[PDB]
Amino acid sequence: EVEQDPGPFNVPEGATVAFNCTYSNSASQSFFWYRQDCRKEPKLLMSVYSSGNEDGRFTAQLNRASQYISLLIRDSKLSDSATYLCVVNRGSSYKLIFGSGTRLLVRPDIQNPDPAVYQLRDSKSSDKSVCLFTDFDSQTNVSQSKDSDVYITDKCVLDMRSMDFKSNSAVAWSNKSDFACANAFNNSIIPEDT
Amino acid sequence: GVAQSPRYKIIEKRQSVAFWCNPISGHATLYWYQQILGQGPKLLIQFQNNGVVDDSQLPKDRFSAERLKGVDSTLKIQPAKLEDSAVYLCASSQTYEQYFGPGTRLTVTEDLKNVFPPEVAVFEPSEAEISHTQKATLVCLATGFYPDHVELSWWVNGKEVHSGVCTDPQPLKEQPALNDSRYALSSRLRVSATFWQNPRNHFRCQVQFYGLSENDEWTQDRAKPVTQIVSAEAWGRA
Structure with missing residues (x-):
């Protein structure tokens, strides 16, 4: 039995985030934190050595007497968003047991919000459109559509890395003949509505 | 590996x-x-x-x-x-x-008759965003696909890019009520207003869909939904 935080952890960028994981067999010898994006495989984040481990923002600790390992992420960044797997060998064997995972989502620090809702025309001439709600800060949340035949994506953070500019956006669209962007992005923030 | x-x-x-x-x-x-x-x-x-x-x-x-x-x-x-x-x-x-x-x-x-390839459209940046922000967000829409086995990528002048992109981590069900619902997926690419206004810059949204093969019996009137790429494109505009 390997047990870790149920999660999820939803923290603002910059926050310290603490994970803890407990293992039931005292004889267990090898301990790891693995990380996993949603459509990917487990990759090793750090082994947890007898003295623990340190790597930049990341610290791990082993308390063998109490039978737990810890992971501490300081000054968390958007790139830390992933699922964190606790991993401990089945006592007195090479087989590994994986915990159920803790989902971490780090929200981007948006300092220059400029919330706006824009309409965008298809590049192929079909007079079809989508709606873009963008440049809002990470304290704005986006709810699923409450209307059938209306579609609203969750928010999504893009990173114009060359310059250190992030920005949030969500997409909405509908085939309903009178659909207008305000019908999906109803009152949420003070956006410029062109 | x-x-x-x-x-x-x-x-x-x-x-x-x-x-x-x-x-x-x-x-x-x-x-x-x-x-x-x-x-x-x-x-x-x-x-x-x-x-x-x-x-x-x-x-x-x-x-x-x-x-x-x-x-x-x-x-x-x-x-x-x-x-x-x-x-x-x-x-x-x-x-x-x-x-x-x-x-x-x-x-x-x-039932493999539930399988559908995506349809892909690229939506051009809004003129109002360009003047308001000096930036240009293009949006890609993949809709109608099932199963949720796709890889969406952005290509600028023959070349795959990751900066200025994010693609929804999860698709949306087009009929949440149903268990075999088809899926939609949106992605955005954001570039500078100057880059979008250059008419020699070429933008393509590519969706790789994983589906059936030549070895699967198929009798629907639509064509077999094989593994394939569906894409849509746009050039910058002055």
Whole structure:
């Protein structure tokens, strides 16, 4: 039995985030934190050595007497968003047991919000459109559509890395003949509505 | 690293599957895991060389696996159930530390007639965003696809880009009520206003869809939904 935080952890960028994981067999010898994006495989984040481990923002600790390992992420960044797997060998064997995972989502620090809702025309001439709600800060949340035949994506953070500019956006669209962007992005923030 | 084939597979319930894995060269231990959305990897079988050391967790009379020569290994599900939809992970090791392959995402579905390729459209940046922000967000829409086995990528002048992109982590069900609902997926690419206004810059949104093969019987009036790429494109505009 390997047990870790149920999660999820939803923290603002910059926050310290603490994970803890407990293992039931005292004889267990090898301990790891693995990380996993949603459509990917487990990759090793750090082994947890007898003295623990340190790597930049990341610290791990082993308390063998109490039978737990810890992971501490300081000054968390958007790139830390992933699922964190606790991993401990089945006592007195090479087989590994994986915990159920803790989902971490780090929200981007948006300092220059400029919330706006824009309409965008298809590049192929079909007079079809989508709606873009963008440049809002990470304290704005986006709810699923409450209307059938209306579609609203969750928010999504893009990173114009060359310059250190992030920005949030969500997409909405509908085939309903009178659909207008305000019908999906109803009152949420003070956006410029062109 | 560890290699696995395929990356995605759609099968009808009752059919069989195979998953192939190739350890890191010389690794004596090989592991298969099932991982369903929300949980960790769970072991199904360990081989140490070509010897089956622990198959106690191997479900029932539907899961088998072979590592006949102690190198690569084949896991099989026969026949398959909808509850088998999961990612199947392969990992190899010498000692404790395991190294994973990229996984095979499995979706088992009632009826292969539920399978549809995506349709892809690119929506051009708003003139109002350009003047308000000096930037240009293009949006890509993949709609109507099933299963949720796609890879969406952005290409600028023949060239794949990652900066200024984000693609929804999860698709939306176009009919949440239904179990076989088709899916939609949006992505954005953001560039500078100057870059978008240059009419020699070429933008393409590419969606790789994993579907049926030439070996699948098909009798719907639409064409077989084979694994394919569907894309849409736009040039910058002055």
